[PDB]
Amino acid sequence: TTALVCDNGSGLVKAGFAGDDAPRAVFPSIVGRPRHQGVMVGMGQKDSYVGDEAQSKRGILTLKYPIEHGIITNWDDMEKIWHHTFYNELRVAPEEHPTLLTEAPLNPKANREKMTQIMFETFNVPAMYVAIQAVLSLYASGRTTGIVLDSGDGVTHNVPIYEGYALPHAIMRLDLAGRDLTDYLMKILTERGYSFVTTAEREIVRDIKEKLCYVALDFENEMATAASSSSLEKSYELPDGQVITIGNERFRCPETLFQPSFIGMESAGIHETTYNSIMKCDIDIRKDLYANNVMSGGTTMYPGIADRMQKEITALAPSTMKIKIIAPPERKYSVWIGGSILASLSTFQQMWITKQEYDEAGPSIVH
Amino acid sequence: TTALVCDNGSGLVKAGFAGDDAPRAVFPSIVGRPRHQGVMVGMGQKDSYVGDEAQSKRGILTLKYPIEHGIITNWDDMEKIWHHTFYNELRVAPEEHPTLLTEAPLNPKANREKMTQIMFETFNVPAMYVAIQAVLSLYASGRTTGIVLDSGDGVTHNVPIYEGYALPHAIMRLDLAGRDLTDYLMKILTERGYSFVTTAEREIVRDIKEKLCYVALDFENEMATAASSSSLEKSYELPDGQVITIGNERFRCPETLFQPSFIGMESAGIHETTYNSIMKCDIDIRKDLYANNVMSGGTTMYPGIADRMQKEITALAPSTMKIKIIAPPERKYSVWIGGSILASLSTFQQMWITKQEYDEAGPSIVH
Amino acid sequence: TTALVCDNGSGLVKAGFAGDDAPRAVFPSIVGRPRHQGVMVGMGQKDSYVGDEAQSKRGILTLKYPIEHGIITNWDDMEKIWHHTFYNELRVAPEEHPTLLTEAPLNPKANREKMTQIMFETFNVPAMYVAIQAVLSLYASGRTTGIVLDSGDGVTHNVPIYEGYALPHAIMRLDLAGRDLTDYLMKILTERGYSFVTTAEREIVRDIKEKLCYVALDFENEMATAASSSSLEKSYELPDGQVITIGNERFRCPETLFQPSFIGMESAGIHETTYNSIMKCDIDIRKDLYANNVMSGGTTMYPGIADRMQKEITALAPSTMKIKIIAPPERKYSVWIGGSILASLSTFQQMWITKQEYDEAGPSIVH
Ligand SMILES: Nc1ncnc2c1ncn2[C@@H]1O[C@H](COP(=O)(O)OP(=O)(O)O)[C@@H](O)[C@H]1O
Ligand SMILES: Nc1ncnc2c1ncn2[C@@H]1O[C@H](COP(=O)(O)OP(=O)(O)O)[C@@H](O)[C@H]1O
Ligand SMILES: Nc1ncnc2c1ncn2[C@@H]1O[C@H](COP(=O)(O)OP(=O)(O)O)[C@@H](O)[C@H]1O
Ligand SMILES: [Mg+2]
Ligand SMILES: [Mg+2]
Ligand SMILES: [Mg+2]
């Protein structure tokens, strides 16, 4: 038997057996109950559709993401994600695979207890471990030192690791992006008359967030050049047929990551949380936090980064210091490519939670 | 085969086989425990890093000097200093080499016994001799008479030696230099906002004690030119982005050597310990103590000495007596260049402690 | 006419004329600009609200404390604190009152000069003196000898005074508390799902630092009884209606005072800085510093000290030495009750800085 690396995405849950390429299965985590009367009565209709079927039945359901602010909203829907995934996606037996699960560095307890407990008693996995997503993005990177910027929809993190230790008093969590970037994009699409009201229509917003957004090099000059009559304007096509023309707002929405006041978030931007996390680390270690600034996750893949991120950090940081922004190929699968390396090496198999230990100590005192 | 001269520095431990030019190994003596949580778990991280690597891995460790106020603070770290030095620096086996160790003339007994005993019983050397650090600097100096200064971070001593034997009742111990100069520099750089709070950051202070400091010719008039618009400000560069500009305090810290009331030490300065040790020596011998004054150790290498020390001694000394304060080139290796000359010469090699005599007498009668 | 004692709070600026019972005005020192679009247009909204009214107008502003790590961060807002205090609280003319101002024992210069200079040239005070806060707590103490532990949010100090002299070679400053205690409390309330990321709610964290915290007598046994189902849990009420139930973390947070490791600070605890400052003083003068251990400042108000503080000092100190921990009622006003006694005394009113001296000597020779 082989171990299974399953990343508890907040998107965009990722699943695949131990190594070597990229996750076997990726899906948007949606469950949706039917919001219009069934009186056609074929019948044959499912009580709750999961993805991908919840993306081929839009407008007849009400899509509900089961993870909200990085917290499992109800484990009733979450367990159904898991069951659906193991049985009708991956097609593997629970009692036959040691698993690897992920979490967020700054998150409430007993959220990991209740998780660990429900998966051991419901699915009876033969072994389990729960890793923070940032440490796996360090393993994925393959650098041995650096400050990790792990940004997925929608919990970001700033974790500093230096060969091979970490500082407790340094992690910063912003709930800045990205589901709020979806809502903000929906609020500034009203500026060109596009009103997307329903849950289903929110997916269309997400599709323009995927394909057509970019980030500016300099805010003031992109705002200036938007005022020019020259066509920044991009023509999107709608699944119903319609042609949607977006301009200014196309670079405005991601720019929020360099200015949270515009989305109504008081705290300082990714720009400043990077600097302020570096200046919570000791004198010697700062030298190598500069030039081991490592980004990760799907929401760091916008076209205007990393050279925006580069120019902005390089301006605020102390003069004459070597600053390079490490941005891997295919950051969306970074965490998973991390997890594969971890569970395949010796000896951290003997840092896995196992059934004998669970029988003795249950959800209590896991470390 | 060849005998080994290993000088028990208080700094800055010095090691090299017998003959002729300079020590083969010099290192900051630091042992450092791991102070942060080891979340990477690669791992390969050793239980404790010694120097030199504990000076390239600062902030991930907490440096604890193993010799404190001139006494070995714990032999658990000290034995590891020795073992690390013999095996992974010099690259030799102790059963193959007679060793030569150093001590201080005004230190506790039986801490020289316990040293001698632990190295004979732990490392199994075939022969040993223990010299006080001042006497070896006389052989290095090549003089037949004079007062000897071993001044290191943090115990100095002042020993008068005549032709061909020493004067028992004239030895003076000042605890004034040099770790108290390190700590005083760390307290008076805070007055210009350079608040070096942590243990690790204290090493950076020590590095500014090497390069930037100097000594005055007259305190009152150097204090005058600090008040002047003229630059006494020298700008140092740090491993972090930070350019530090110190002025007055740059010459203020070493001046403590001629005024221990600055560091709140009640003892009289180098000025007075020179004079008062000479005026505890006999009238006839004083004639040849003047103009046979030998400085040694790393903390006598500051720029503004020795003609400050000279001018101060010439002011207190009797009228019409010729006084030249002659201190060698390359003082940092002085003690060691002593030890090489001693252990290579006939005949007192056959007055060394040897394995059978150690078996017979143990730590008893080591004087 | 009458002299005015105005204490330059780290919190918590305190003001009242010479004598008797307590300061007449106490306030949290915050300035806050409005972080929202002002499109209601009443109008009448001030450019920035100072305290205390800015603590009844939270959330519609972004509160910024003017003193950060024991230094005044920008003197424009500091000057506005002063201007607001004299004019819109006290209602006294600066040209009519000789004042008394405070500072921290170990702080960079020209921080007291630049302050003194700005207050003389901007507000045109007729006479002034600047006292360090620990010395003023000596008059409040009512003992003429002893070691002063002055801890306010966030500068602690350890000053030894012996009838009626001060030992300069022994003052210890820990930057251990208290804004970092607020921040640590905000970070360990996330463990029970209570997260308070934005500025206004951070005040509420400070309020829970008052009310529900207590110092443990035995850490290991309080952690044990926390593991038990016994009601260590206290129910707080939150301004929007929420009921917050905190347990463990209530006694964990203040315990940081004896374990700097909790906040990740390298430095030694109050436990050890008390002992290590005493063992930097002269032999005959700590036997009278034991039992004249005098606490001060608002961050020593917690229940659970002083008999924790007592047991901890008594455990590290040598046997057969009498120990007593002097902790006044109302330590929050200690500094001020000091200042009142000072400004009433003859003759050292004529050792205050007068305008004639300032006209002649300016910002030089202040100390
Ligand atoms: N090319 C792209 N440009 C911008 N955003 C993208 C792109 N591709 C995916 N995303 C966003 O990234 C999110 C997925 O991030 P992910 O790395 O899965 O986070 P997590 O792993 O925490 O769930 C999606 O919600 C999507 O909105
Ligand atoms: N150029 C320099 N100027 C001033 N001090 C120095 C210089 N070089 C070394 N030192 C000091 O001298 C010390 C080393 O002295 P050393 O002769 O090794 O004493 P010991 O042999 O007793 O250990 C170091 O702690 C360092 O602070
Ligand atoms: N009952 C209490 N328990 C614990 N902490 C308190 C209590 N009352 C006040 N404090 C803390 O003490 C601080 C005020 O201390 P203070 O003596 O004003 O310091 P300073 O005078 O240096 O400003 C506040 O920041 C508050 O957090
Ligand atoms: Mg994530
Ligand atoms: Mg020495
Ligand atoms: Mg204070």
Author numbering:
A (entry chain D), B (entry chain B), C (entry chain C): 5 to 371
Show passages lifted from the paper.
Myosin motor proteins are responsible for movement and force generation across multiple scales of biology ranging from muscle contraction to cell migration to intracellular transport. In this study, we focus on the MD of myosin VI, an unconventional myosin motor unique in its ability to walk ‘backwards’ towards actin filament pointed ends. Here we present cryo-EM reconstructions of myosin VI bound to F-actin in the rigor state at 4.6 Å resolution and the ADP state at 5.5 Å resolution along with corresponding atomistic models. Finally, by comparing the conformation of actin in the myosin VI-bound ADP and rigor state structures to bare filaments, we find that actin structural deformations accompany motor conformational changes during the force-generation cycle.
As we expected actin conformational changes to be subtle, we obtained a reconstruction of F-actin alone at 5.5 Å (right), as well as a corresponding MDFF model to control for error in micrograph pixel size calibration and differences in processing procedures with previously reported structures. The lower resolution of this reconstruction vs. those bound to myosin suggests that myosin binding may rigidify the filament and reduce inherent conformational flexibility. The refined helical parameters are essentially identical for all three filament states we report here, in contrast to both myosin IIC and myosin V, where myosin binding has been reported to induce a 0.5–0.8° change in azimuthal rotation. Despite this preservation of filament architecture, the actin protomer adopts a unique conformation in each of the three states, with local deformations occurring at the actomyosin interface mediated by the D loop and, intriguingly, at distal lateral contacts in the interior of the filament mediating the interaction between the two strands of the actin filament. Consistent with what has previously been reported for myosin IIC and IE, this flexible loop also shifts upon myosin VI binding, orienting slightly towards the MD. Both the ADP and rigor states exhibit excursions of the D-loop relative to the unbound state, with a Cα RMSD of 1.0 Å in both cases. Unexpectedly, myosin VI engagement shifts the H-plug towards the two actins located on the opposite strand, with an increasing deviation of position from the unbound actin state as the motor proceeds from the ADP state (Cα RMSD 0.9 Å) to rigor (Cα RMSD 1.6 Å). As the unbound actin state represents the conformation adopted by F-actin in the absence of exogenous factors, we propose that our free actin model represents a low-energy conformation of the H-plug and D loop in the context of the filament.
